[PDB]
Symmetry: C3
Subunit: 107 residues, 3 copies
């Protein structure tokens, strides 16, 4: 039991009597609202969810102005600097054979 | 003065004569459009805003394919590498008692 | 050929017979659905696209709980730690005149 508006059985909007609203097409793209969430569904394999005071994307590449986050959750900025791969020059040292570990970043 | 469509006083859409469109439920989830913004409101404590050629989320955890941004704006990738906490091995040095500071990342 | 709902020629929704749905105002804010995408258009110069199992924002600053990504795709956390600018202390070394390069981050 809901109200449904549809054009040619291809494009739809539905409003139910309990807090659910859905806009969708037969291809499976959807924009949903429920009592506690907003969800954008991409039929090609992505979903953006706002629920519980959190925001989640799960899918393929996220691109924010050229900064990228892979499907595996690794980040590289638009210049190619990877959070998980980057290195730093360290100047002003004596060379030798030992290894030390840096501290966390300044700031 | 606006047009309102509502099902059972639970689900709503409104269109005004000035550029404002709202889709919402009584629980307080909302999708709003104004003359200069699109806003997704999560009643559980989150908001995503597109306005002024900028995009802002303010709320709890942001999760992008397993990479996380805390409510405080600190980032950790899906492997646990924190932008603000990570360290690096530094090989090929002589040990001693001094501290140096690295340069910014290569790349 | 589509169905259009409009209030005062200022606020609009359209549903076509092929999978396209659009909600928009004369100011140029838009929420679009197509057979394979969802697009939020900010007339002030931003666009968020879900398509092909990917999510893209292209525009000005992205702010996620105080962490920022510039229009150029560089990231700084809410404490000012830049992925592309940060440095690390390196303790326990002998000073000298040489440069070494760190390894990638631990973790
Ligand atoms: Fe580093
Ligand atoms: Na990448
Ligand atoms: Na990984
Ligand atoms: Na790198
Ligand atoms: Na510490
Ligand atoms: Na800082
Ligand atoms: Na985290
Ligand atoms: Na903090
Ligand atoms: Na870390
Ligand atoms: Na520099
Ligand atoms: Na690079
Ligand atoms: Na910044
Ligand atoms: Na740049
Ligand atoms: Na920094
Ligand atoms: Na490696
Ligand atoms: Na780790």
């Amino acid at each position: 039991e809901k109200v449904i508006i549809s054009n040619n059985k291809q494009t739809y909007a539905s409003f139910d009597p309990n807090g659910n609203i859905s806009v969708y097409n037969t291809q499976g793209m959807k924009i949903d609202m429920t009592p506690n969430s907003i969800v954008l569904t991409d039929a090609g394999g992505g979903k953006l969810t706002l629920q519980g005071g959190t925001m989640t994307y799960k899918g393929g590449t996220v691109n924010l102005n050229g900064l990228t986050i892979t499907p595996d959750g690794r980040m590289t900025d638009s210049g190619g600097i990877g959070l998980h791969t980057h290195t730093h020059p360290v100047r002003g040292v004596e060379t030798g054979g030992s290894t030390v570990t840096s501290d966390k970043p300044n700031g």
